[PDB]
Amino acid sequence: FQGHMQLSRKGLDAIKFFEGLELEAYEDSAGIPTIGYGTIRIDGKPVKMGMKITAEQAEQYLLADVEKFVAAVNKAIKVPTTQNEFDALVSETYNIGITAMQDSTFIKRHNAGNKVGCAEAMQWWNKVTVKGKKVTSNGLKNRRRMEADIYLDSVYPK
Secondary structure (H helix, E strand, O other), X not given: OXXXXXXXXXXXXXHHHHHOOEEEEEEOOOOOEEEEOOEOEEOOEEOOOOOEOOHHHHHHHHHHHHHHHHHHHHHHOOOOOOHHXXXXXXXXXXXXXXXXXXXXXXXXXXXXXXXXXXXXXXXXOOEEEEOOEEEEOHHHXXXXXXXXXXXXXXOOOO
16 A cells, blocks of 8 residues: 555644744754744755745745655555544654654554554654754654644644
């Protein structure tokens, strides 16, 4: 089985919620110019300081950004998958990246029908590298618990 699922409206709303929104470019904590819903590239080109966009543009850029992540989750899933399970897996993959999702325990458990196990293993992805050392991010712990709620219970953030 290969996926042809799409991110739902509720799934896009959840990724928006996790990213936050700025209409003026800002330099993130790592020094990368960022705009909209966590966008760092627009139509293949970097975000630039001083740029201002509309909320409509921000949604357009986020839709373009998430497309390859939707594709990758479709290709990684080997079993029938509910819309909320798909939304959660795309949200998490959008944060951890394609390679991390592909080789993850959570995707193995999803493909074995072990939903509870998948929700547990999803939440292992809470570390960030700081000064060459892996540090637990409280922000990521929060995002992981909200993505597990989408995956298991179809309960989306507000």
